[PDB]
Amino acid sequence: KSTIDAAKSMATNVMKKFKKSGLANSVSTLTDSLSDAASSISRGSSIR
Amino acid sequence: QNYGINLPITGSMDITSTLCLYYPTEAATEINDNSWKDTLSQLFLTKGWPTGSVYFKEYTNIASFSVDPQLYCDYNVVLMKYDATLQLDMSELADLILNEWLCNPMDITLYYYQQTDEANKWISMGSSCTIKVCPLNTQTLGIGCLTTDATTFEEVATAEKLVITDVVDGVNHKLDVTTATCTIRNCKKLGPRENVAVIQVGGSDILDITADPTTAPQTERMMRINWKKWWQVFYTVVDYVDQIIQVMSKRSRSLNSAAFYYRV
Amino acid sequence: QNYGINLPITGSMDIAYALTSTLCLYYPTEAATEINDNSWKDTLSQLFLTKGWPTGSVYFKEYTNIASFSVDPQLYCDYNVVLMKYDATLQLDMSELADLILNEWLCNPMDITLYYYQQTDEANKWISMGSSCTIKVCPLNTQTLGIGCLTTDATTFEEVATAEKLVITDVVDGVNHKLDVTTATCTIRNCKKLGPRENVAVIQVGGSDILDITADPTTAPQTERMMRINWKKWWQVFYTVVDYVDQIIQVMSKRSRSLNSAAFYYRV
Amino acid sequence: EYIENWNLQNRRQRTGFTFHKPNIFPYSASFTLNRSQPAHDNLMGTMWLNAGSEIQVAGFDYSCAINAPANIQQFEHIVPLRRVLTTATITLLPDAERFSFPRVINSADGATTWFFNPVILRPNNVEVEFLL
């Protein structure tokens, strides 16, 4: 219900902050883990 | 939260920062650059440090660095340029910068004194401090010196910017100082400090952190290295910083846990 | 026979068990100048002969000044002992000489007039040997911009050694640098510290011990291959190091690179 | 019981011999290396003693796996039996009390010995696999 001009890329301005929140880096960490899982056989199962 | 008790902990067998550098002036004098601190800041960034929280402090001489010593910083690496002259001064300086000293003041014009435990010393700092002593019989009478005298005393130190004095204990002594020039605090050592690491440059690791003769307890904090140029030392410092960080721990007094347990 | 393929090896704790080893001794000058004889070598020879060691097996190569001995120390011999005459003013060079000739450095050469470089691990150093080395180094940030030094010329960098014959720099890992020396004077090689060398034993005759081999500040160990004795007449030093030369020999071991089984494992 | 198992191995029925603490493991106290220096300033290997009715294994490294990938060093050790067992109730204690004190041990070729001063950690991802 905020009807004012200069209503800029509220989505993207949101995105600028969202792309640094803990959930994001954690998701990247999760994908990184899943990647690590697919490479290491020449090193033994290092994940408990 | 629950301080002030000594409450046994259980366990099992299944389960920002500040890096802080002090340096002698002659070094930067040999360097002849000025933006250098900024350069080493960039390098500490590259090794993982936040930009704009690392501080370098500058002392003119180790004597000067001895008086009013104050370290307030998460991780202190203190360099010392050796000299075959001040071996006592450097030993007792590393000592004062290795321990936790429970200290109280003194007035040597109105009482006698003593040492009551082997972890007790009399520390003195000032501009030109030169202390004299006279141990006292059980009858409070002087020996080889008289409470009325000030010259038959037994001299123990001389114009040393700092001194760590110790005597045989369980026995009283009347002293001689200049209090509007020097302060002498009665202090008790308690534990080792984890916020300090003393890198000596030049020399052969000669330190002794106890007035105890029988042992020369060498530890993991009194490190040594050689030099031919200063940037050499600083590069060794910055690159090898991680193992040093692993040596020095967070200040066990600092954590909001030691409250009302002789917390700093 | 089966080489270079590291396969496990079965020993046992079940069976107890009931010459060609060549000492190769070096020595400095003022010692000799005080010895005042040209047969001392022969006396040492005959003594070693009586001790159980062949005649013609021991050789004496002499070094003149410590900085002179720093270049090209190819100490090729079955067992090597270096007696260094200590200095209270020349220390760092002794420490780095020990470091070099007691460890094994596998190094590749560089061309600093062209390439940037950067060290890799806490076991990677830059050895620099020759006549008169004057290193010039200039660190860089991530896109090749001078930091405390100007890359548009050469004379504004930060020197780390002057009037040195042999010096081994260690640089902050993970950053590129510009480099200059006079590449007609001395040479720098990028060495990886592969593993300790066991062919050599260095003993010092003079003041207090200073020796450390790790450029690590925290770890300043005292290995066994580093020994120290006092002196006021070099004769007794020689005589004595031959009196206990049995124990010295038992301390060291055969060079783990020339054993006919160290084939395809870095020098054989 | 024993005459009974006799008459059973006569009558072609599944035989059964119950036992308390059987001495089934043969005696062999030997060690194994994965990496060896002729002077032993860099090693990686295992020791194990299997005596009476128990086995004690212990894998050791001098580098504590610092150079190794991802700060992990694996260790394997297998034991086959010459006679299969049944309904075993095994006990498993993580340690090597037998390999916990500084030793001087004879090399494989038989001319010199080597040193051992270990310091104990607790093993992680311990997997015991009873395969048929």
Residue B215 has φ and ψ, to the nearest 5°, of -130, 150
Across C182-239, the runs of DSSP E, i.e. the strands, are 186-196, 200-205, 226-229
Q: Which chains touch A (3 or more CB pairs under 8 A)?
A: D
Residue B28, C-beta contacts closer than 8 angstroms, at least 6 positions apart: B36, B58
Q: Which chains touch B (3 or more CB pairs under 8 A)?
A: C
Q: Which residues of B touch C161 (CB under 8 A)?
A: 228-229, 232
D111 CA: distance to closest CA in chain A (Å): 35
Annotated binding site of B for Ca(2+): 33, 89, 92, 115, 144, 152, 154, 160, 162, 166-167, 169, 239
Query: Are C170 and B239 in contact (CB < 8 Å)?
Result: yes
Nearest CA in chain A to D124: A48
Helices within chain B (DSSP H only): 25-31, 36-46, 62-66, 87-96, 230-239, 241-247
Q: How many other CB atoms sit within 10 Å of the CB of residue C182?
A: 12
Q: Determine contact, residues C137/C231, Cβ cutoff 8 Å.
A: no
Structure tokens at C178: 């510009």
Residue B70, C-beta contacts closer than 8 angstroms, at least 6 positions apart: none
How wide is the angle at C-alpha B234 spanned by C-alphas C142 and B73, nearest 5°? 95
Residue D65 Cα to chain centre, angstroms = 21
Tell the residue number behind the tokens 């299944």, with chain if given.
B14
Interface list for chain B against chain C, based on CB atoms closer than 8 Å: 33, 35-36, 39, 42-43, 46-47, 199, 204-205, 220, 223-229, 231-232, 235-236, 238-240, 243-244, 247
**CA dihedral over C120, C122, C123, C126, signed as positive or negative:** positive
Cα(B174)–Cα(B110) distance, integer angstroms? 10
Q: Which helix (H) or strand (E) holds A29?
A: helix A22-39
Helices within B32-86 (DSSP H only): 36-46, 62-66
For strand D28-35 and strand D44-51, is the pairing parallel, antiparallel, or unpaired?
A: antiparallel
For strand C177-180 and strand C124-139, is the pairing parallel, antiparallel, or unpaired?
A: antiparallel
Complete edge-to-edge strand list for the sheet that includes strand B120-126 = B99-104, B182-192, B120-126, B162-165
Query: Are B33 and C141 in contact (CB < 8 Å)?
Result: no
Q: Determine contact, residues B197/B247, Cβ cutoff 8 Å.
A: yes
B230-239 vs B36-46: helix crossing angle, rounded to 10: 20
Mutate to test the interface with D, among C5, C7, C17, C254 (most CBs of D within 10 A): C17
Helix count (H) and strand count (E) of chain D?
A: 1, 5
Nearest CA in chain D to C18: D111
Q: Determine contact, residues C138/C175, Cβ cutoff 8 Å.
A: no
Helix (H, G, I), strand (E, B) or coil at B136: strand
Nearest residue to B68 (alpha-carbon basis) of B59, B77, B76: B59
Tell the residue number behind the tokens 């509007």, with chain if given.
B180
A39 CA: distance to closest CA in chain D (Å): 12
C79 CA: distance to closest CA in chain B (Å): 30
Q: Which residues of D touch C16 (CB under 8 A)?
A: 106
Structure tokens at D68: 């190794």
Tell the residue number behind the tokens 């029925």, with chain if given.
D13
Structure tokens at B249: 């721990």
A22 CA: distance to closest CA in chain D (Å): 24
Residue C66 has φ and ψ, to the nearest 5°, of -55, -45
Output the 3-class SS for A11-24. Answer: HHHHHHHHCCCHHH
Residue B36 has φ and ψ, to the nearest 5°, of -60, -45
Query: Are A43 and D69 in contact (CB < 8 Å)?
Result: yes
Q: Which helix (H) or strand (E) holds C23?
A: strand C23-27
Query: Are D110 and C8 in contact (CB < 8 Å)?
Result: no
Nearest residue to C168 (alpha-carbon basis) of C87, C111, C98: C98
Nearest residue to B243 (alpha-carbon basis) of B116, B92, B77, B126: B77
Distances, alpha carbon C68 to alpha carbons A47, B200, C65, in Å: 54, 29, 5
Helix (H, G, I), strand (E, B) or coil at C21: coil
Residue D2 Cα to chain centre, angstroms = 32
Q: How many other CB atoms sit within 10 Å of the CB of residue D100?
A: 13
Distances, alpha carbon B221 to alpha carbons B57, B200, B205, B232, D46, in Å: 20, 11, 11, 20, 35
Q: Which residues of D touch A44 (CB under 8 A)?
A: 72, 74
Q: Which helix (H) or strand (E) holds C168?
A: strand C158-169
Q: Which residues of C touch B232 (CB under 8 A)?
A: 160-161
**Nearest CB neighbour to B247, from listed C147, C172, C218:** C218
Residue B156, C-beta contacts closer than 8 angstroms, at least 6 positions apart: B131, B132, B133, B163, B165
Report which residue type is found at B56: F
Cα(B1)–Cα(B259) distance, integer angstroms? 9
Task: Write B203-212 long-range contacts (CB < 8 A, 24+).
Answer: B203/B82, B204/C208, B204/C209, B204/C210, B205/C220, B206/B87, B206/B90, B206/B91, B207/B90, B207/B91, B207/B94, B207/B95, B208/B91, B208/B95, B209/B91, B209/B94, B209/B95, B209/B98, B209/B99, B210/B95, B211/B121, B211/B164, B211/B166
Output the 3-class SS for D38-64. Answer: CCCCCCEEEEEEEECCEEEEEEEECCC
Complete edge-to-edge strand list for the sheet that includes strand D44-51 = D28-35, D44-51, D54-61
Task: Write B255-258 long-range contacts (CB < 8 A, 24+).
Answer: B257/B3, B258/B3
Q: Determine contact, residues B200/B80, Cβ cutoff 8 Å.
A: yes
**CA dihedral over D93, D95, D96, D100, signed as positive or negative:** negative
How wide is the angle at C-alpha B244 spanned by C-alphas B242 and B246, nearest 5°? 75
Query: Are D72 and A48 in contact (CB < 8 Å)?
Result: no
For strand C79-85 and strand C177-180, is the pairing parallel, antiparallel, or unpaired?
A: unpaired
Q: How many other CB atoms sit within 10 Å of the CB of residue C90?
A: 12
> Do B and A have ≥3 inter-chain CB pairs under 8 A?
no
Length of chain A: 48
Tell the residue number behind the tokens 């006292």, with chain if given.
B136
DSSP label at residue C186: E
Length of chain B: 264
D3 CA: distance to closest CA in chain A (Å): 51
Across chain B, the runs of DSSP E, i.e. the strands, are 19-24, 55-59, 75-81, 99-104, 120-126, 132-135, 154-155, 162-165, 173-176, 182-192, 196-201, 222-225
Method of structure determination: cryo-EM
Burial class (CB in 10 A: 0-12, 13-18, 19+), C215: buried
Structure tokens at B68: 């009013």
Nearest CA in chain D to C11: D108
Residue C139, C-beta contacts closer than 8 angstroms, at least 6 positions apart: B39, B43, C147, C148, C149, C172, C175, C176, C177
Q: Determine contact, residues B173/B113, Cβ cutoff 8 Å.
A: yes
Annotated binding site of D: 20
Structure tokens at C52: 């159980």
Mutate to test the interface with A, among D72, D76, D122 (most CBs of A within 10 A): D72
DSSP label at residue D71: G
B117 sits in the region (left: phi over 0; alpha: psi -120 to 50; else beta) called beta
Nearest residue to B219 (alpha-carbon basis) of B249, B239, B242: B249
Q: Determine contact, residues C157/C189, Cβ cutoff 8 Å.
A: no
C164 CA: distance to closest CA in chain D (Å): 33
Helix (H, G, I), strand (E, B) or coil at C37: coil
Report which residue type is found at B168: V
Q: Which residues of B touch C156 (CB under 8 A)?
A: none
Nearest residue to D114 (alpha-carbon basis) of D40, D34, D60, D29: D40
Return the number of CB contacts < 8 Å for B and C. 68
C234-243 vs C40-51: helix crossing angle, rounded to 10: 20
Query: Are B236 and C218 in contact (CB < 8 Å)?
Result: no
Distances, alpha carbon B29 to alpha carbons A32, B56, B198, C111, in Å: 49, 15, 22, 33
Nearest CA in chain D to A43: D69
Return the number of CB contacts < 8 Å for C and D. 46
Structure tokens at C64: 């003149």
Q: Determine contact, residues C242/C132, Cβ cutoff 8 Å.
A: no
Nearest CA in chain C to D30: C12
Burial class (CB in 10 A: 0-12, 13-18, 19+), D87: exposed
Q: Which helix (H) or strand (E) holds C42?
A: helix C40-51
How wide is the angle at C-alpha B242 spanned by C-alphas B255 and B43, nearest 5°? 110
For strand B222-225 and strand C103-109, is the pairing parallel, antiparallel, or unpaired?
A: unpaired
Structure tokens at B130: 């030169």
Give the CB-side neighbour count of residue B241, counting CA atoms within 13 A. Answer: 24
Helix (H, G, I), strand (E, B) or coil at D70: helix
What is the Cα gyration radius of chain D?
20
Burial class (CB in 10 A: 0-12, 13-18, 19+), B210: middle
